[PDB]
Amino acid sequence: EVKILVDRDPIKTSFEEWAKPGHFSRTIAKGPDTTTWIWNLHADAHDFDSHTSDLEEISRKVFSAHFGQLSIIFLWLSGMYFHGARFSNYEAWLSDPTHIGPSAQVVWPIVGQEILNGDVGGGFRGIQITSGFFQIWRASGITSELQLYCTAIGALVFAALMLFAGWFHYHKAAPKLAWFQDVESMLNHHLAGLLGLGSLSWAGHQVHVSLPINQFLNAGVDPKEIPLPHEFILNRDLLAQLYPSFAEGATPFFTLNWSKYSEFLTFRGGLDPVTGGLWLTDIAHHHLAIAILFLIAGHMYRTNWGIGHGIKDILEAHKGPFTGQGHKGLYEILTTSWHAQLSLNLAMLGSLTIIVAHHMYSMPPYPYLATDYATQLSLFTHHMWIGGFLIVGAAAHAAIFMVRDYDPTNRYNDLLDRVLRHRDAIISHLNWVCIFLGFHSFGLYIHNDTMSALGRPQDMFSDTAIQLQPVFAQWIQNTHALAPGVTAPGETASTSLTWGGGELVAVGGKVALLPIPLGTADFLVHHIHAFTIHVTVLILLKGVLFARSSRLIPDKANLGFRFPCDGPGRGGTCQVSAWDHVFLGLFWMYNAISVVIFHFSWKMQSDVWGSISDQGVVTHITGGNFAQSSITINGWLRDFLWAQASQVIQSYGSSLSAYGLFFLGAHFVWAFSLMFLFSGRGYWQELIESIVWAHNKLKVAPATQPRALSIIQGRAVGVTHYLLGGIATTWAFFLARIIAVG
Amino acid sequence: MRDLKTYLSVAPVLSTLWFGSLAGLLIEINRLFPDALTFPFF
Amino acid sequence: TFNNLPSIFVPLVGLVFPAIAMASLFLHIQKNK
Amino acid sequence: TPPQLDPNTPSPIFAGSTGGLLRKAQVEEFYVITWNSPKEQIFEMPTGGAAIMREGPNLLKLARKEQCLALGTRLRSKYKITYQFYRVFPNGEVQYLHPKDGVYPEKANPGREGVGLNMRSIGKNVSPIEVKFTGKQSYDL
Amino acid sequence: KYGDKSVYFDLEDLGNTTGQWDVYGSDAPSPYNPLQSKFFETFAAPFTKRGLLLKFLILGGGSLLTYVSANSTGDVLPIKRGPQEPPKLGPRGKL
Amino acid sequence: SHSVKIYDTCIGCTQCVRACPTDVLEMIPWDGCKAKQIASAPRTEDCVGCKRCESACPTDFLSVRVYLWHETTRSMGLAY
Amino acid sequence: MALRFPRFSQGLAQDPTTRRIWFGIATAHDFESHDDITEERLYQNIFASHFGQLAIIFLWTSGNLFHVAWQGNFETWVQDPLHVRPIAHAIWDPHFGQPAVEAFTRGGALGPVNIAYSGVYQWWYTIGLRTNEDLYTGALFLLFLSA
Amino acid sequence: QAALYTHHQYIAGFIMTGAFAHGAIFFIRDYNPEQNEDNVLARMLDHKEAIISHLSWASLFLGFHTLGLYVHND
Numbered sequence A: 001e002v003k004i005l006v007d008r009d010p011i012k013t014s015f016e017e018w019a020k021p022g023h024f025s026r027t028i029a030k031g032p033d034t035t036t037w038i039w040n041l042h043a044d045a046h047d048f049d050s051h052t053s054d055l056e057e058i059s060r061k062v063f064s065a066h067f068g069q070l071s072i073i074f075l076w077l078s079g080m081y082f083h084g085a086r087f088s089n090y091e092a093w094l095s096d097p098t099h100i101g102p103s104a105q106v107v108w109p110i111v112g113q114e115i116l117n118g119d120v121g122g123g124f125r126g127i128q129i130t131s132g133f134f135q136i137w138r139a140s141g142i143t144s145e146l147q148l149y150c151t152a153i154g155a156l157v158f159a160a161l162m163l164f165a166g167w168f169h170y171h172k173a174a175p176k177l178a179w180f181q182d183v184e185s186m187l188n189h190h191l192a193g194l195l196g197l198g199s200l201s202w203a204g205h206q207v208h209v210s211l212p213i214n215q216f217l218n219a220g221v222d223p224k225e226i227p228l229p230h231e232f233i234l235n236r237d238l239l240a241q242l243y244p245s246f247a248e249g250a251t252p253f254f255t256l257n258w259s260k261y262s263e264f265l266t267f268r269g270g271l272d273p274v275t276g277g278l279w280l281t282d283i284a285h286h287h288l289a290i291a292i293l294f295l296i297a298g299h300m301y302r303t304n305w306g307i308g309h310g311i312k313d314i315l316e317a318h319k320g321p322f323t324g325q326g327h328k329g330l331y332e333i334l335t336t337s338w339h340a341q342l343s344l345n346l347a348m349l350g351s352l353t354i355i356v357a358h359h360m361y362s363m364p365p366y367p368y369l370a371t372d373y374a375t376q377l378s379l380f381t382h383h384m385w386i387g388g389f390l391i392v393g394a395a396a397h398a399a400i401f402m403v404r405d406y407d408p409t410n411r412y413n414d415l416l417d418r419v420l421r422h423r424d425a426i427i428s429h430l431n432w433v434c435i436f437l438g439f440h441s442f443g444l445y446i447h448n449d450t451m452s453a454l455g456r457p458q459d460m461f462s463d464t465a466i467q468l469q470p471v472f473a474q475w476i477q478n479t480h481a482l483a484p485g486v487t488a489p490g491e492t493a494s495t496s497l498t499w500g501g502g503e504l505v506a507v508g509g510k511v512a513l514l515p516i517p518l519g520t521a522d523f524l525v526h527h528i529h530a531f532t533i534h535v536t537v538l539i540l541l542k543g544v545l546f547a548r549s550s551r552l553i554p555d556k557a558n559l560g561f562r563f564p565c566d567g568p569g570r571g572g573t574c575q576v577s578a579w580d581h582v583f584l585g586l587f588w589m590y591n592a593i594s595v596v597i598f599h600f601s602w603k604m605q606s607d608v609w610g611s612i613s614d615q616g617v618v619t620h621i622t623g624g625n626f627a628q629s630s631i632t633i634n635g636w637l638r639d640f641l642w643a644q645a646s647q648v649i650q651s652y653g654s655s656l657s658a659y660g661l662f663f664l665g666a667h668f669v670w671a672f673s674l675m676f677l678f679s680g681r682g683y684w685q686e687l688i689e690s691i692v693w694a695h696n697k698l699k700v701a702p703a704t705q706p707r708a709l710s711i712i713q714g715r716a717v718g719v720t721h722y723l724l725g726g727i728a729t730t731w732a733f734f735l736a737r738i739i740a741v742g
Numbered sequence B: 001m002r003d004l005k006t007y008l009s010v011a012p013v014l015s016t017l018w019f020g021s022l023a024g025l026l027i028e029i030n031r032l033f034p035d036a037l038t039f040p041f042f
Numbered sequence C: 001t002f003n004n005l006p007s008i009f010v011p012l013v014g015l016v017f018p019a020i021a022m023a024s025l026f027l028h029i030q031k032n033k
Numbered sequence D: 001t002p003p004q005l006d007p008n009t010p011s012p013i014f015a016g017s018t019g020g021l022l023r024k025a026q027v028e029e030f031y032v033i034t035w036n037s038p039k040e041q042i043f044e045m046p047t048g049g050a051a052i053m054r055e056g057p058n059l060l061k062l063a064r065k066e067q068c069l070a071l072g073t074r075l076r077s078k079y080k081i082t083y084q085f086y087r088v089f090p091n092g093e094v095q096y097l098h099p100k101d102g103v104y105p106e107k108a109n110p111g112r113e114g115v116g117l118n119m120r121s122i123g124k125n126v127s128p129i130e131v132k133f134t135g136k137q138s139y140d141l
Numbered sequence E: 001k002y003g004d005k006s007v008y009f010d011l012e013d014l015g016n017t018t019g020q021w022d023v024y025g026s027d028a029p030s031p032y033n034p035l036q037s038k039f040f041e042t043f044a045a046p047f048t049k050r051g052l053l054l055k056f057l058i059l060g061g062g063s064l065l066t067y068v069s070a071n072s073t074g075d076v077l078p079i080k081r082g083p084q085e086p087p088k089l090g091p092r093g094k095l
Numbered sequence F: 001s002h003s004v005k006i007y008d009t010c011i012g013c014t015q016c017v018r019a020c021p022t023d024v025l026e027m028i029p030w031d032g033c034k035a036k037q038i039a040s041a042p043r044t045e046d047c048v049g050c051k052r053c054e055s056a057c058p059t060d061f062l063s064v065r066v067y068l069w070h071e072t073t074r075s076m077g078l079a080y
Numbered sequence G: 001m002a003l004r005f006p007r008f009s010q011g012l013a014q015d016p017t018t019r020r021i022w023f024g025i026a027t028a029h030d031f032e033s034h035d036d037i038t039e040e041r042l043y044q045n046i047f048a049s050h051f052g053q054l055a056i057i058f059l060w061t062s063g064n065l066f067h068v069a070w071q072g073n074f075e076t077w078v079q080d081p082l083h084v085r086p087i088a089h090a091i092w093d094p095h096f097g098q099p100a101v102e103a104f105t106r107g108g109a110l111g112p113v114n115i116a117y118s119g120v121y122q123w124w125y126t127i128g129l130r131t132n133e134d135l136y137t138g139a140l141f142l143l144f145l146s147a
Numbered sequence H: 001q002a003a004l005y006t007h008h009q010y011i012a013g014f015i016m017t018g019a020f021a022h023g024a025i026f027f028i029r030d031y032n033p034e035q036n037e038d039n040v041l042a043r044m045l046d047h048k049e050a051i052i053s054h055l056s057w058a059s060l061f062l063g064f065h066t067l068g069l070y071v072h073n074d
């Protein structure tokens, strides 16, 4: 059985614990002996597994914390919808969504920053946004600032609702461990109800709102004299004139005569030629079918009645050809460790974010998204970075599971023990394939540089040279270009047009995804990507597996997950902790995702994004220079970094001056991080003690004793500023370039 | 309100209040006296 | 034969002398009296 | 005290791992730890993984002293059993290592002598100029 | 006794406890034909002496390398061809 | 190998020995402190150099004191 | 003094690890920290090392002079100096492609060459040293000073 | 001229860094405080905090204001 299992008033709502800082632990709820107290206060702020050593209080804390995060996300959504309501050119963008830059931010004219309000178009002076929110709102059929305003008030209502819910589910009526530990119900509800009915209700919105309004806007209609969605619901003649399938009603549905519903739930593959997005009929059919799928999927696990599955019953009965006797005890560790679940969920959520980027650049689902090149670049770049970060967090929390929440005595698993046993084979073969990949990708780039510098372009690795053609990806493109004719006859066109064919869905003077070719350079850079991914996996999996013990430190789980070292002995143990491994995997995730988004931006600016002429020949942004310049690192330095970073230096003056500024400042903070990564706490503590002498000599000695940052905190500040500066440099570069060229 | 004035007395809350007030002061001065490079009032 | 002298010495200092020095210094590295 | 004279006692039930005796045992010294477990139970061994130590006497051969003493401290703190490990050179001559007096080193047993012990504060050490061009360092007078 | 039930510390048989086993070393006899073996044993014996093999390889590899580079015509490698083009003037006249 | 010399400012708290993962240190009897014991260092040849002994020494600066020196296979933390 | 390669230090020679190699390379010229060292022997090693450095300096200058005398256009540079490119030395790189031989041929040379951006042309021309035989004589004299 | 100026200035910065590194090596290896009590060299270590803190003032002032003006102009 799965009861409600909550208790009333576990924690008293009061500001007494607001007053005393660092109340949540033993060594912080005393007061600052030093300035390390503040850093250890913020560091252990959400380390609920360190505050209270029971899963009940931990689970209540993370539940109400998720409510706070949801309140924050709803508040942020309210902000975006409101800035789209009162501080935007959304109407002018709807009237002409090809020459009006999406803008939903206006600056205040105070210190000359008013020049950041650019001529985006539509009688509006503001900042051209890149979140693609205008494209979402055209996919929803908004067509009015009143609707954005009222959904902003609704998102504020939901933010207050989530904040009250967190307060209620911590302080007034909080669940106990019997409520969280049951997961068959959590999965059943999050499948059938969250994701099932969520997709169902979004398909209902689309069937009843998005499809008619977008068909009207595609036919050509001023958004002011467009009928409202409730007119489509109520006035049946109207929606029936849009789609006569509505005239029959749901007796098509309940008599299973769905063939006549194929006027608004088509399987019309490919992109909408009128607007460059996907077909919203296809998307409505999609969300409907996904709703049916997740609704039948959320009735799989046994919760309170006889039917269903036990996840314990599945995992403990899953024998197979390769270590199927295992899988026993995983229900124990996953229902008694929030860090295991956090690691797994972060891994899959970040991988889904990356899947999201890769499927949004190529199958642009919103109207007029593919031709807002800033929107496409920003979305792919963003979700790539988010996915990489979330995977690195999966590493961090796998490690925190391995150190703290791992007991072979009580909670034993055969598979995890077998992984820890041969972990040196794992890391050795992964180190090897990392070296192999580094060589046979980056050394190919170095060979290309040397040969092109020695005047031997016949000896390079290129299409006009020694060819390393991606035969497998080219074969997949050949199949999927021919898939809908034989293998998927329900589709009139392919799922995407990146495969091949005489398909080039231009909406105006802009391309929107012609077929992306795959040459030698794409082989090279895809193997660079496999390389950087494998090195990130090396570092992170190595920290995970060696979080507990090694041949160097066999008592590392007693030192903790997040400790600097075990001293200079054994030669040195400087970055032996699993925290240090995620800290290095962050740098390698940075390298990986940065070369990924560089590949993306250059490939699209050279082979896809561009203008289309009245004769029918496409002129790309860079001009197809990816197959000849992106084989050499000098070409990435010259034809990509030096060439595309002309708009960010000429940005000064026009609206993009901020992107110019945020270039250099980002360039700084990255370098500012190098003060932390290269150095060590000892030098800074001695400098600080000299400065403390200078302060004692003026009766201005502080009582919070100045201490240099912790070693781990120096590394954290370093990787933090490093990622911030590098990523903000790339963000300024990307957005300035693509807003100044497309 | 007891123990709210102690929280608002804490270094970050007090720093954000002081720097919000100070930044608004500087911002409104630069609105009143924009584009200043000299002190000509003597 | 003076434009041929670079062809004699650039390998002899760059390939042959490095092999000689690397071998000899690797033996000196691993010697035990 | 007389040492404990390492016998051929049994070993824990372990399925094997990649954390054993590679070459530091073939040509150099390797180590061996013996502990009397009152009952058969599972424990995280320092070479990665999880073994099941048997009831009565157990014996585990490890690659270095830190593995042995880490496992020993975890045994003495978690299972409260009395461990004692050795060092076995590849020709023999098993060396009794850990307690060295029967009682653990945190207890001030008499008989053990003062070695590595300066009768001065730490900042009364002479400077390196005093011991320059001499084989001695500033912490050996 | 190393072959007892879960005893792996036979002190006199310290090769089985340390892991001195030949994982793949076969003591099986000579598989090659003895005449082929005699041919290789007589024809490769000159290279057996190490101190005379290191010296030989040094003074033979360096000789062959400094020779084949010297008598390499301007068809194998282009550095020995020459410019084979009118030399262009540099910036600012030539400076 | 290493050189773990201790000084007479030790108070006999037995934390340097309770932190030592290689049994370098051991408390001996002594008459220079309230606890009447001091931490010797016979097995300096087993010292890895991790300085857990002096990250647990509650003196004004330090009593136990690790001076890194000639590194052997026991002092380089080598299981191979 | 010691056995293995860091003969000057029996602490690195008695190091089974690869740290021996590195630290014996690095601490080779730290005579103050070597075994069996005296102030006398330290000073004498310093003196002989200074001699070695002076020898290498004169050898490097002799190499500059020889490669400007042999492979340089110095006799042509002293005619029209501010419109003729210096030549540091020739180049025989067997990895060069024919375009790179066409490109690195500068200063009116029989083959590919490197442009002396070091100023030895200007300095030598200012202190006399007109013909290439003068630079040959200078390189011979600096070989003599190296010896 | 550019190669020469860059050469000699990087050489000079390195040589200066080495001058100071060898002063540190002198203070560790070769300095005898009992031989030079209260002299002009021990007085460095008597007030080293003042030197270090006023260098830490001058550099901090220069960086704050140089960077502030450069960023103002940016």
Ligand code: CLA
Binding pocket: A011, A012, A013, A014, A015, A017, A018, A023, A024, A060, A061, A062, A064, A065, A067, A068, A069, A072, A163, A164, A165, A166, A167, A170, A171
């Ligand atoms: C005003 C109402 C109120 C009051 C008086 C309290 C009072 C208390 N809460 Mg409760 N709580 C509330 C609302 C309230 N809570 C709400 C709305 C939530 C849902 C998020 C929670 C969730 C919650 C949890 C999960 C826990 C508490 C705990 C506590 C105690 C410690 C408070 C403390 O030191 O943190 C004071 C901290 C703050 C004031 C920080 C505010 C952080 C907010 C939520 C996010 C702001 C982020 C911001 C947007 C991003 C940064 C931007 C910046 C860089 C500019 C105390 C009894 C703890 C406890 O008793 O356990 C021992 C505990 O574990 N509370």
Ligand code: CLA
Binding pocket: A062, A063, A066, A067, A070, A179, A180, A182, A183, A185, A186, A189, A190, A192, A193, A194
């Ligand atoms: C079918 C019912 C249902 C639905 C819709 C959800 C939905 C959600 N749950 Mg789950 N949950 C359910 C049943 C359900 N749960 C059950 C039965 C249990 C017990 C086993 C849990 C236990 C559980 C935990 C432990 C946690 C969640 C979390 C979440 C949220 C994840 C964030 C997200 O995707 O944002 C999408 C956002 C939205 C869809 C907006 C939400 C707006 C509505 C008002 C709330 C959804 C309905 C909800 C169940 C409340 C019912 C009414 C209430 C008055 C009783 C999400 C809102 C996590 C979370 O975010 O913490 C707050 C979390 O930590 N749930």
Ligand code: CLA
Binding pocket: A042, A043, A044, A045, A046, A047, A048, A342, A346, A389, A390, A391, A392, A393, A394, A396, A397, A400, A561, A562, A579, A582, A583, A586, A720, A724
């Ligand atoms: C679902 C997401 C999720 C969740 C719930 C958690 C939860 C947690 N993490 Mg994990 N983590 C995540 C994602 C997540 N993390 C990701 C994506 C990464 C990769 C970077 C990590 C990497 C990571 C490490 C390496 C560690 C944790 C730790 C922790 C714990 C304590 C964190 C804390 O108190 O800091 C409270 C919050 C802060 C101190 C603020 C952080 C400030 C960030 C880094 C600056 C960036 C802000 C912004 C983008 C920059 C501009 C700012 C502007 C003002 C200038 C807690 C269990 C720690 C732990 O458990 O150790 C015992 C730990 O050591 N996490």
Ligand code: CLA
Binding pocket: A430, A431, A432, A434, A435, A436, A437, A438, A439, A442, A443, A446, A535, A538, A539, A584, A585, A587, A588
């Ligand atoms: C450009 C800078 C750079 C380079 C070249 C490397 C190189 C490497 N890193 Mg490092 N790393 C760097 C920066 C760099 N790193 C930074 C800034 C960080 C900050 C955190 C790290 C952190 C880091 C970690 C944490 C890890 C690595 C790993 C690796 C290796 C993976 C690739 C490999 O071996 O393939 C082959 C070698 C290369 C691709 C390197 C370039 C060599 C090119 C291809 C040509 C070689 C020419 C040839 C040998 C001729 C030589 C000349 C001749 C005279 C002898 C390799 C040694 C991983 C590792 O060692 O395990 C596999 C690992 O786990 N690195």
Ligand code: CLA
Binding pocket: A110, A111, A112, B026, B029, B030, B034, B035, B036, B037, B038, H064, H065, H067, H068, H069, H071, H072
């Ligand atoms: C450290 C380097 C540095 C320096 C010297 C300056 C200097 C200046 N900047 Mg630049 N700036 C800098 C860094 C710097 N900035 C950085 C780092 C940035 C990026 C964040 C900027 C960004 C920036 C912008 C964007 C702007 C400036 C502006 C200015 C001018 C300020 C005019 C103003 O509002 O003050 C007026 C005076 C005050 C605000 C002080 C008032 C103090 C209160 C009222 C108390 C005084 C009275 C007191 C009681 C005593 C009375 C005496 C007695 C009766 C008691 C001035 C020339 C502005 C300008 O005009 O451009 C030239 C402008 O628009 N700066």
Ligand code: CLA
Binding pocket: A668, A669, A671, A672, A673, A674, A675, A676, A678, A679, A683, A687, H055, H056, H057, H059, H060, H061, H062, H063, H064, H067
């Ligand atoms: C761009 C990179 C960078 C920067 C800015 C600095 C800056 C500094 N270094 Mg250097 N350092 C660097 C790289 C850098 N370092 C590297 C790569 C290394 C090698 C490890 C070192 C090694 C090093 C040593 C070894 C020493 C320094 C020292 C210093 C300080 C010198 C005094 C000075 O100029 O202060 C003026 C202040 C600045 C230049 C700081 C810039 C930031 C602005 C002005 C502050 C305000 C920004 C903003 C409003 C804050 C809001 C953000 C956030 C709260 C949301 C200063 C903090 C010395 C020191 O600290 O003693 C004084 C010192 O001894 N650094």
Ligand SMILES: CC1=C(/C=C/C(C)=C/C=C/C(C)=C/C=C/C=C(C)/C=C/C=C(C)/C=C/C2=C(C)CCCC2(C)C)C(C)(C)CCC1
Binding pocket: A077, A150, A151, A152, A153, A154, A155, A158, A197, A198, A200, A201
């Ligand atoms: C945007 C947004 C917003 C809003 C939103 C909305 C407005 C939503 C809605 C939603 C909705 C409005 C939903 C609904 C749903 C529904 C459903 C999901 C249904 C289902 C049904 C079923 C399942 C059925 C069954 C059956 C049948 C079939 C018939 C008869 C019988 C029965 C009943 C059994 C806000 C403000 C928040 C803010 C943020 C953002």
Ligand SMILES: CC1=C(/C=C/C(C)=C/C=C/C(C)=C/C=C/C=C(C)/C=C/C=C(C)/C=C/C2=C(C)CCCC2(C)C)C(C)(C)CCC1
Binding pocket: H016, H019, H020, H021, H022, H023, H024, H026, H027
């Ligand atoms: C104006 C003029 C003039 C004058 C001038 C003057 C007077 C100047 C001065 C200048 C100066 C006044 C400079 C200085 C420099 C310095 C330096 C550069 C320093 C350095 C230092 C160091 C490097 C250190 C080291 C060490 C240590 C650390 C400790 C131990 C000891 C020793 C020392 C070793 C006349 C009229 C004549 C002429 C014209 C111009």
Ligand SMILES: CC1=C(C/C=C(\C)CCC[C@H](C)CCC[C@H](C)CCCC(C)C)C(=O)c2ccccc2C1=O
Binding pocket: A675, A676, A677, A679, A680, A681, A682, A684, A685, A707, A708, A709, A710, A711, A713, A714, A715
């Ligand atoms: C720069 C640096 C420091 C010194 C950095 C300091 C101590 C941290 C920065 C602290 C700030 C400047 C403190 C001041 C903020 C206070 C809240 C005061 C606010 C009041 C006014 C200043 C507004 C380290 O301690 C360190 C440690 C280990 C590895 C690398 C490094 C490292 O690179």
